[PDB]
Design a protein around this ligand. Structure first.
Ligand SMILES: [Mg+2]
Ligand SMILES: [Mg+2]
Ligand SMILES: [Mg+2]
Ligand SMILES: [Mg+2]
Ligand SMILES: [Mg+2]
Ligand SMILES: [Mg+2]
Ligand SMILES: [Mg+2]
Ligand SMILES: [Mg+2]
Ligand SMILES: [Mg+2]
Ligand SMILES: [Mg+2]
Ligand SMILES: [Mg+2]
Ligand SMILES: [Mg+2]
Ligand SMILES: [Mg+2]
Ligand SMILES: [Mg+2]
Ligand SMILES: [Mg+2]
Ligand SMILES: [Mg+2]
Ligand SMILES: [Mg+2]
Ligand SMILES: [Mg+2]
Ligand SMILES: [Mg+2]
Ligand SMILES: [Mg+2]
Ligand SMILES: [Mg+2]
Ligand SMILES: [Mg+2]
Ligand SMILES: [Mg+2]
Ligand SMILES: [Mg+2]
Ligand SMILES: [Mg+2]
Ligand SMILES: [Mg+2]
Ligand SMILES: [Mg+2]
Ligand SMILES: [Mg+2]
Ligand SMILES: [Mg+2]
Ligand SMILES: [Mg+2]
Ligand SMILES: [Mg+2]
Ligand SMILES: [Mg+2]
Ligand SMILES: [Mg+2]
Ligand SMILES: [Mg+2]
Ligand SMILES: [Mg+2]
Ligand SMILES: [Mg+2]
Ligand SMILES: [Mg+2]
Ligand SMILES: [Mg+2]
Ligand SMILES: [Mg+2]
Ligand SMILES: [Mg+2]
Ligand SMILES: [Mg+2]
Ligand SMILES: [Mg+2]
Ligand SMILES: [Mg+2]
Ligand SMILES: [Mg+2]
Ligand SMILES: [Mg+2]
Ligand SMILES: [Mg+2]
Ligand SMILES: [Mg+2]
Ligand SMILES: [Mg+2]
Ligand SMILES: [Mg+2]
Ligand SMILES: [Mg+2]
Ligand SMILES: [Mg+2]
Ligand SMILES: [Mg+2]
Ligand SMILES: [Mg+2]
Ligand SMILES: [Mg+2]
Ligand SMILES: [Mg+2]
Ligand SMILES: [Mg+2]
Ligand SMILES: [Mg+2]
Ligand SMILES: [Mg+2]
Ligand SMILES: [Mg+2]
Ligand SMILES: [Mg+2]
Ligand SMILES: [Mg+2]
Ligand SMILES: [Mg+2]
Ligand SMILES: [Mg+2]
Ligand SMILES: [Mg+2]
Ligand SMILES: [Mg+2]
Ligand SMILES: [Mg+2]
Ligand SMILES: [Mg+2]
Ligand SMILES: [Mg+2]
Ligand SMILES: [Mg+2]
Ligand SMILES: [Mg+2]
Ligand SMILES: [Mg+2]
Ligand SMILES: [Mg+2]
Ligand SMILES: [Mg+2]
Ligand SMILES: [Mg+2]
Ligand SMILES: [Mg+2]
Ligand SMILES: [Mg+2]
Ligand SMILES: [Mg+2]
Ligand SMILES: [Mg+2]
Ligand SMILES: [Mg+2]
Ligand SMILES: [Mg+2]
Ligand SMILES: [Mg+2]
Ligand SMILES: [Mg+2]
Ligand SMILES: [Mg+2]
Ligand SMILES: [Mg+2]
Ligand SMILES: [Mg+2]
Ligand SMILES: [Mg+2]
Ligand SMILES: [Mg+2]
Ligand SMILES: [Mg+2]
Ligand SMILES: [Mg+2]
Ligand SMILES: [Mg+2]
Ligand SMILES: [Mg+2]
Ligand SMILES: [Mg+2]
Ligand SMILES: [Mg+2]
Ligand SMILES: [Mg+2]
Ligand SMILES: [Mg+2]
Ligand SMILES: [Mg+2]
Ligand SMILES: [Mg+2]
Ligand SMILES: [Mg+2]
Ligand SMILES: [Mg+2]
Ligand SMILES: [Mg+2]
Ligand SMILES: [Mg+2]
Ligand SMILES: [Mg+2]
Ligand SMILES: [Mg+2]
Ligand SMILES: [Mg+2]
Ligand SMILES: [Mg+2]
Ligand SMILES: [Mg+2]
Ligand SMILES: [Mg+2]
Ligand SMILES: [Mg+2]
Ligand SMILES: [Mg+2]
Ligand SMILES: [Mg+2]
Ligand SMILES: [Mg+2]
Ligand SMILES: [Mg+2]
Ligand SMILES: [Mg+2]
Ligand SMILES: [Mg+2]
Ligand SMILES: [Mg+2]
Ligand SMILES: [Mg+2]
Ligand SMILES: [Mg+2]
Ligand SMILES: [Mg+2]
Ligand SMILES: [Mg+2]
Ligand SMILES: [Mg+2]
Ligand SMILES: [Mg+2]
Ligand SMILES: [Mg+2]
Ligand SMILES: [Mg+2]
Ligand SMILES: [Mg+2]
Ligand SMILES: [Mg+2]
Ligand SMILES: [Mg+2]
Ligand SMILES: [Mg+2]
Ligand SMILES: [Mg+2]
Ligand SMILES: [Mg+2]
Ligand SMILES: [Mg+2]
Ligand SMILES: [Mg+2]
Ligand SMILES: [Mg+2]
Ligand SMILES: [Mg+2]
Ligand SMILES: [Mg+2]
Ligand SMILES: [Mg+2]
Ligand SMILES: [Mg+2]
Ligand SMILES: [Mg+2]
Ligand SMILES: [Mg+2]
Ligand SMILES: [Mg+2]
Ligand SMILES: [Mg+2]
Ligand SMILES: [Mg+2]
Ligand SMILES: [Mg+2]
Ligand SMILES: [Mg+2]
Ligand SMILES: [Mg+2]
Ligand SMILES: [Mg+2]
Ligand SMILES: [Mg+2]
Ligand SMILES: [Mg+2]
Ligand SMILES: [Mg+2]
Ligand SMILES: [Mg+2]
Ligand SMILES: [Mg+2]
Ligand SMILES: [Mg+2]
Ligand SMILES: [Mg+2]
Ligand SMILES: [Mg+2]
Ligand SMILES: [Mg+2]
Ligand SMILES: [Mg+2]
Ligand SMILES: [Mg+2]
Ligand SMILES: [Mg+2]
Ligand SMILES: [Mg+2]
Ligand SMILES: [Mg+2]
Ligand SMILES: [Mg+2]
Ligand SMILES: [Mg+2]
Ligand SMILES: [Mg+2]
Ligand SMILES: [Mg+2]
Ligand SMILES: [Mg+2]
Ligand SMILES: [Mg+2]
Ligand SMILES: [Mg+2]
Ligand SMILES: [Mg+2]
Ligand SMILES: [Mg+2]
Ligand SMILES: [Mg+2]
Ligand SMILES: [Mg+2]
Ligand SMILES: [Mg+2]
Ligand SMILES: [Mg+2]
Ligand SMILES: [Mg+2]
Ligand SMILES: [Mg+2]
Ligand SMILES: [Mg+2]
Ligand SMILES: [Mg+2]
Ligand SMILES: [Mg+2]
Ligand SMILES: [Mg+2]
Ligand SMILES: [Mg+2]
Ligand SMILES: [Mg+2]
Ligand SMILES: [Mg+2]
Ligand SMILES: [Mg+2]
Ligand SMILES: [Mg+2]
Ligand SMILES: [Mg+2]
Ligand SMILES: [Mg+2]
Ligand SMILES: [Mg+2]
Ligand SMILES: [Mg+2]
Ligand SMILES: [Mg+2]
Ligand SMILES: [Mg+2]
Ligand SMILES: [Mg+2]
Ligand SMILES: [Mg+2]
Ligand SMILES: [Mg+2]
Ligand SMILES: [Mg+2]
Ligand SMILES: [Mg+2]
Ligand SMILES: [Mg+2]
Ligand SMILES: [Mg+2]
Ligand SMILES: [Mg+2]
Ligand SMILES: [Mg+2]
Ligand SMILES: [Mg+2]
Ligand SMILES: [Mg+2]
Ligand SMILES: [Mg+2]
Ligand SMILES: [Mg+2]
Ligand SMILES: [Mg+2]
Ligand SMILES: [Mg+2]
Ligand SMILES: [Mg+2]
Ligand SMILES: [Mg+2]
Ligand SMILES: [Mg+2]
Ligand SMILES: [Mg+2]
Ligand SMILES: [Mg+2]
Ligand SMILES: [Mg+2]
Ligand SMILES: [Mg+2]
Ligand SMILES: [Mg+2]
Ligand SMILES: [Mg+2]
Ligand SMILES: [Mg+2]
Ligand SMILES: [Mg+2]
Ligand SMILES: [Mg+2]
Ligand SMILES: [Mg+2]
Ligand SMILES: [Mg+2]
Ligand SMILES: [Mg+2]
Ligand SMILES: [Mg+2]
Ligand SMILES: [Mg+2]
Ligand SMILES: [Mg+2]
Ligand SMILES: [Mg+2]
Ligand SMILES: [Mg+2]
Ligand SMILES: [Mg+2]
Ligand SMILES: [Mg+2]
Ligand SMILES: [Mg+2]
Ligand SMILES: [Mg+2]
Ligand SMILES: [Mg+2]
Ligand SMILES: [Mg+2]
Lengths: 200, 64, 115, 143
RNA sequence: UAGCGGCGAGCGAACGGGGAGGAGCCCAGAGCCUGAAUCAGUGUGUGUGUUAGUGGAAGCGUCUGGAAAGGCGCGCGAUACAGGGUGACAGCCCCGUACACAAAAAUGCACAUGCUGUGAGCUCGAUGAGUAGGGCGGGACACGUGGUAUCCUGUCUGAAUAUGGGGGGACCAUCCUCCAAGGCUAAAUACUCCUGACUGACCGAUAGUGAACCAGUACCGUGAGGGAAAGGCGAAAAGAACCCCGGCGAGGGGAGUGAAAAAGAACCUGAAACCGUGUACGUACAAGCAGUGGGAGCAUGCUUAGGCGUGUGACUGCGUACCUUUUGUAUAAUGGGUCAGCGACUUAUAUUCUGUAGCAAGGUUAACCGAAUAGGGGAGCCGAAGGGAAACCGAGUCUUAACU
């Protein structure tokens, strides 16, 4: 079903993995949840309890012509309080397995329509060198890419660490945001076979 | 933390199939000889909670 | 994400103090006083679009009543005279004709005299 | 699709009520909670089942019954989820492996919930009169 | 949930499951035979690590500018495009980075292993008395003495001690299960004054620590103790030599430095309140929330051979501030001297309802295991069936002797 650019081999891929209607809401939700999961959420202000200072009333309740105060630390005073102080919290949100798989199936099928998904045979650099990888993408006519590979080569990996617009994920380690972010997606025939089985 | 059920209410109401609650009638513990038999007979079987006081029951026992 | 609000507040106050431009004392200078003046100005403005239509009608009617009595007829009888001759001309114009072209105006008072 | 071009379904998101933000907001000054009284106050509002000091419904009504110990450890097996164990044998330990009833349930009963196809010999289990007609109409012999 | 509970407010198990981590032994002592396998010496031995470090790739020309890293055009290293500096934004100017390497000396580890020193074996018996239990009074158990098991005990008492004793939630009897009245035990677990590295949908000088600054300082208090304020010239001090007014002052004017000195140290930006100097109009017979609709003149901007903007506003119709609280406020009821900054429906987990997305009689996982937002793991939960106080029966069932 997906022709290659140096073979023209008929790789018969499953229909309901790579040929579906683009459900925008599901994909949006899954990428938003994936984004929300990226947060570490490390922050804290200090409440009127946590501020340093005495509990003492600076001046008494009545008697003096001045607004009744009860603490130096009160949030309406300067240098003390923050009413609703933040606590370190976890913004990660649950995504249903079927929704995550469904979103991947939705986005990964839309690449076929848009022609971002460049399925290929064996893709591997000769030696662990960036100069060669950068040179070989000139002939392939690629710049901002996600080189997905089943057999993850250290030679290919090391050679794409310094290249910014190139990223080399494993066929197992595809993501919702990654598949959308990069301008093309180069999948190896083994990686398509693995992802096919993974998504199912 | 989880919600705590108002146990006293949990021992006086039971959830029926639809959503309403069955409860036992008041006025059938003591002082029975002066009451007519017709009353005591009508007070014996369980009864459904009225729609006015249903929200008060639904709040105080959120599980079942 | 802490939000400072010095840039936006100033822009809000400065907007109103621009509308208060021309008022006396604090009413131009001091937001807290100006804001009331600018609202009141709006309330009065809203009101006086209604009263502008009233005042001018009175102004016209007085002019027509003045110009009619030079020719020897009162406003009340004049307008009834014009109505009874199916004349559709309004107060605004009768008042303008009364001031400008009296030799013309005189013909309307005769036209009214017919009825 | 780009990371920007994505958008949610209409009606999914609904902003949220932000209290105390001017007249134009609608709610603002007394954030939808009226003038004065216990309910207007921070940390206000009465506790559950409180009817102004009147004896509450959950206290003026009598308490009845007792929670059975035996009812806690007995299940009501649906006859739809009958032929999902081991061919046509459904004792107890076999049924427990299929995750139909809980672990601490010795006594159990097969009720008429509809639909059987295969013959199932129901051993060491209590069976209903309607299910006895069905199970045998499908084929299998009970006990 | 079961229970507990002025059966109120509330408090809240275990069995049972899924995980993390797993490990056991010494004594209350008698044969042959023997120091052996165990802890620990203390070596020395790798292996380390930690406390100094070494190398570490490849850019040029024009244009704008005070200055180039910038734009423009061509190169090149990349297992180095982490990050920082540099006169504006640097892969290639510098410090780093990846990576490759380090130790005289002290130490923290993991295995050989000479050993002052210590008992491997089957044995044979033993097998923890003011104790278990009881009365009285308290307490701990989810369990408030209740029908109250269980454990501990202040007090007063008292077995049997494996033919024995404990327990199985009043209690009894049968079965099952353990063996009290002595010790010692790694891991999974809690924490971070402190030492590093690294990360933030954390803050950016009224914030963030009280403290960016010689801050727990000044200052306050007899004392315990309380406790501030106060950041930024410029790329580089090149921090203004020299004149001039002045008291060989302050302070200015020059001159000079700089790209700039209304960047000159009271030093980036420099708002508002508030206080001034000059230009246009109005203003000394006129009554009040001071505006608002009308509106002459006058002053400027323009197009001109009409007028239309702009400032002003003679005279004139209408016109008792805002907030709060109220049956009702111009009210002589509350609150505000003004400006600037900060200042109030939040966060976590449970729960019901509405919208929306997935999948559908199914839906769905929790901790965890994954380095890993994959995928396992369905232990569970919820739903598809209810009636009954409950046994029990179940498309019925409860009531009742039986139900139209
Ligand atoms: Mg405190
Ligand atoms: Mg205190
Ligand atoms: Mg005190
Ligand atoms: Mg006062
Ligand atoms: Mg005062
Ligand atoms: Mg401070
Ligand atoms: Mg603070
Ligand atoms: Mg605050
Ligand atoms: Mg959160
Ligand atoms: Mg949330
Ligand atoms: Mg999650
Ligand atoms: Mg998962
Ligand atoms: Mg890009
Ligand atoms: Mg990964
Ligand atoms: Mg009774
Ligand atoms: Mg009666
Ligand atoms: Mg009778
Ligand atoms: Mg009687
Ligand atoms: Mg529940
Ligand atoms: Mg900020
Ligand atoms: Mg402000
Ligand atoms: Mg301002
Ligand atoms: Mg602006
Ligand atoms: Mg405002
Ligand atoms: Mg301004
Ligand atoms: Mg004006
Ligand atoms: Mg004026
Ligand atoms: Mg002003
Ligand atoms: Mg002003
Ligand atoms: Mg009119
Ligand atoms: Mg919308
Ligand atoms: Mg909206
Ligand atoms: Mg939003
Ligand atoms: Mg919210
Ligand atoms: Mg809010
Ligand atoms: Mg509203
Ligand atoms: Mg409203
Ligand atoms: Mg409301
Ligand atoms: Mg109020
Ligand atoms: Mg009231
Ligand atoms: Mg109220
Ligand atoms: Mg409060
Ligand atoms: Mg309260
Ligand atoms: Mg009772
Ligand atoms: Mg289960
Ligand atoms: Mg179930
Ligand atoms: Mg059914
Ligand atoms: Mg349950
Ligand atoms: Mg009990
Ligand atoms: Mg009592
Ligand atoms: Mg009772
Ligand atoms: Mg049990
Ligand atoms: Mg267990
Ligand atoms: Mg357990
Ligand atoms: Mg287990
Ligand atoms: Mg761990
Ligand atoms: Mg383990
Ligand atoms: Mg294990
Ligand atoms: Mg061991
Ligand atoms: Mg071990
Ligand atoms: Mg050992
Ligand atoms: Mg040595
Ligand atoms: Mg070494
Ligand atoms: Mg070495
Ligand atoms: Mg070393
Ligand atoms: Mg080191
Ligand atoms: Mg080092
Ligand atoms: Mg270098
Ligand atoms: Mg250069
Ligand atoms: Mg130029
Ligand atoms: Mg130049
Ligand atoms: Mg120059
Ligand atoms: Mg350049
Ligand atoms: Mg250059
Ligand atoms: Mg050129
Ligand atoms: Mg060219
Ligand atoms: Mg080029
Ligand atoms: Mg970079
Ligand atoms: Mg960098
Ligand atoms: Mg890097
Ligand atoms: Mg600059
Ligand atoms: Mg710089
Ligand atoms: Mg740059
Ligand atoms: Mg460059
Ligand atoms: Mg740099
Ligand atoms: Mg560059
Ligand atoms: Mg380049
Ligand atoms: Mg290295
Ligand atoms: Mg070497
Ligand atoms: Mg060396
Ligand atoms: Mg070394
Ligand atoms: Mg050396
Ligand atoms: Mg080494
Ligand atoms: Mg050396
Ligand atoms: Mg040496
Ligand atoms: Mg050495
Ligand atoms: Mg040594
Ligand atoms: Mg023996
Ligand atoms: Mg023993
Ligand atoms: Mg023994
Ligand atoms: Mg013993
Ligand atoms: Mg003895
Ligand atoms: Mg003894
Ligand atoms: Mg005992
Ligand atoms: Mg006893
Ligand atoms: Mg006993
Ligand atoms: Mg005792
Ligand atoms: Mg006695
Ligand atoms: Mg006792
Ligand atoms: Mg208690
Ligand atoms: Mg009691
Ligand atoms: Mg107790
Ligand atoms: Mg007691
Ligand atoms: Mg008793
Ligand atoms: Mg009691
Ligand atoms: Mg009781
Ligand atoms: Mg009792
Ligand atoms: Mg016992
Ligand atoms: Mg006892
Ligand atoms: Mg106990
Ligand atoms: Mg004990
Ligand atoms: Mg004796
Ligand atoms: Mg004896
Ligand atoms: Mg003995
Ligand atoms: Mg003896
Ligand atoms: Mg016994
Ligand atoms: Mg016993
Ligand atoms: Mg127990
Ligand atoms: Mg037996
Ligand atoms: Mg003991
Ligand atoms: Mg022991
Ligand atoms: Mg011992
Ligand atoms: Mg060990
Ligand atoms: Mg730590
Ligand atoms: Mg900021
Ligand atoms: Mg910030
Ligand atoms: Mg400051
Ligand atoms: Mg500042
Ligand atoms: Mg501060
Ligand atoms: Mg300041
Ligand atoms: Mg403080
Ligand atoms: Mg100081
Ligand atoms: Mg002092
Ligand atoms: Mg104090
Ligand atoms: Mg003090
Ligand atoms: Mg200050
Ligand atoms: Mg400075
Ligand atoms: Mg500087
Ligand atoms: Mg600089
Ligand atoms: Mg600098
Ligand atoms: Mg000088
Ligand atoms: Mg002189
Ligand atoms: Mg002198
Ligand atoms: Mg002198
Ligand atoms: Mg002199
Ligand atoms: Mg000076
Ligand atoms: Mg001087
Ligand atoms: Mg000077
Ligand atoms: Mg110069
Ligand atoms: Mg110069
Ligand atoms: Mg110059
Ligand atoms: Mg310039
Ligand atoms: Mg200048
Ligand atoms: Mg100069
Ligand atoms: Mg100058
Ligand atoms: Mg100059
Ligand atoms: Mg300037
Ligand atoms: Mg400047
Ligand atoms: Mg100067
Ligand atoms: Mg100076
Ligand atoms: Mg000075
Ligand atoms: Mg200064
Ligand atoms: Mg200043
Ligand atoms: Mg600057
Ligand atoms: Mg300035
Ligand atoms: Mg200034
Ligand atoms: Mg300045
Ligand atoms: Mg300025
Ligand atoms: Mg100013
Ligand atoms: Mg201004
Ligand atoms: Mg002023
Ligand atoms: Mg003045
Ligand atoms: Mg002035
Ligand atoms: Mg002046
Ligand atoms: Mg004048
Ligand atoms: Mg007069
Ligand atoms: Mg006058
Ligand atoms: Mg006056
Ligand atoms: Mg008057
Ligand atoms: Mg008046
Ligand atoms: Mg006006
Ligand atoms: Mg006007
Ligand atoms: Mg003029
Ligand atoms: Mg007037
Ligand atoms: Mg009037
Ligand atoms: Mg008024
Ligand atoms: Mg009024
Ligand atoms: Mg009041
Ligand atoms: Mg009143
Ligand atoms: Mg007033
Ligand atoms: Mg009034
Ligand atoms: Mg007053
Ligand atoms: Mg008063
Ligand atoms: Mg007042
Ligand atoms: Mg008030
Ligand atoms: Mg009052
Ligand atoms: Mg007020
Ligand atoms: Mg006042
Ligand atoms: Mg303000
Ligand atoms: Mg503040
Ligand atoms: Mg809320
Ligand atoms: Mg619903
Ligand atoms: Mg719904
Ligand atoms: Mg819907
Ligand atoms: Mg929907
Ligand atoms: Mg469906
Ligand atoms: Mg792990
Ligand atoms: Mg793996
Ligand atoms: Mg790995
Ligand atoms: Mg982690
Ligand atoms: Mg369940
Ligand atoms: Mg059905
Ligand atoms: Mg039921
Ligand atoms: Mg049921
Ligand atoms: Mg029956
Ligand atoms: Mg019955
Ligand atoms: Mg019956
Ligand atoms: Mg019957
Ligand atoms: Mg009968
Ligand atoms: Mg019958």
């Amino acid at each position: 079903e997906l022709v290659l650019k140096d073979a023209q081999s008929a790789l018969t891929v499953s229909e309901t993995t790579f040929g579906r209607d683009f459900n925008e809401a599901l994909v949006h939700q899954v990428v938003v949840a994936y984004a929300a999961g990226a947060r570490q959420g490390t922050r804290a202000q200090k409440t009127r309890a946590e501020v340093t200072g005495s509990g003492k009333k600076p001046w008494r309740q009545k008697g003096t012509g001045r607004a009744r105060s009860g603490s130096i630390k009160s949030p309406i005073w300067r240098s003390g309080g923050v009413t609703f102080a933040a606590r370190p919290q976890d913004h990660s949100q649950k995504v249903n397995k079927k929704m995550y798989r469904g979103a991947l199936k939705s986005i990964l099928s839309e690449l076929v329509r848009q022609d971002r998904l460049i399925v290929v045979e064996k893709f591997s650099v000769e030696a662990p060198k960036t100069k060669l990888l950068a040179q070989k993408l000139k002939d392939m006519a690629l710049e901002d890419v996600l080189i997905i590979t089943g057999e993850l080569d250290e030679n290919l990996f090391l050679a794409a660490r310094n290249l910014h617009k190139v990223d080399v994920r494993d066929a197992t380690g595809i993501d919702p945001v990654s598949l959308i972010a990069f301008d093309k997606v180069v999948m190896t025939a083994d990686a398509v076979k693995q992802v096919e089985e993974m998504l199912a | 933390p989880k919600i705590k059920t108002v146990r006293g209410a949990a021992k006086r109401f039971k959830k029926t199939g639809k959503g309403g609650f069955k409860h036992k009638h008041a006025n059938l513990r003591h002082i029975l000889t002066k009451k007519a038999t017709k009353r005591k007979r009508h007070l014996r079987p369980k009864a459904m909670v009225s729609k006015g006081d249903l929200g008060l029951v639904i709040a105080c026992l959120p599980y079942a | 994400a802490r939000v400072k609000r010095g840039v936006i507040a100033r822009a809000r106050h400065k907007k109103i103090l621009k509308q208060a431009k021309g008022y006396y004392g604090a009413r131009s200078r001091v937001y807290r006083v100006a804001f009331q003046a600018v609202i009141k100005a709006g309330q009065y403005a809203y009101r006086d679009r209604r009263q502008r239509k009233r005042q001018f009608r009175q102004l016209w009617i007085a002019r027509i009543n003045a110009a009619a009595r030079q020719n020897g007829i009162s406003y009340s009888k004049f307008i009834n005279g014009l109505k009874k001759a199916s004349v559709e001309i309004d107060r605004k114009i009768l008042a303008d004709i009364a001031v400008f072209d009296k030799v013309a105006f005189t013909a309307l008072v005769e036209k009214a005299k017919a009825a | 699709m780009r990371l920007n071009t994505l958008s949610p379904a209409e009606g999914s998101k609904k902003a949220g009520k932000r209290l105390g933000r001017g007249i134009g907001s609608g709610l603002g000054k007394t954030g939808g909670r009226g003038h004065k009284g216990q309910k207007s106050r921070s940390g206000g509002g009465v506790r559950r089942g409180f009817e102004g000091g009147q004896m509450p419904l959950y206290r003026r009504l009598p308490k009845f019954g007792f929670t059975s110990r035996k009812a806690a450890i007995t299940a009501e097996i649906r006859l739809s989820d009958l032929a999902k164990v081991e061919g046509g044998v459904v004792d107890l330990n076999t049924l427990k492996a299929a995750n139909i009833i809980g672990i601490q349930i010795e006594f159990a009963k097969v009720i008429l919930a509809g639909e059987v196809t295969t013959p199932v010999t129901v051993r060491g289990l209590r069976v209903t009169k309607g299910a006895r007609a069905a199970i045998e109409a499908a084929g299998g012999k009970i006990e």
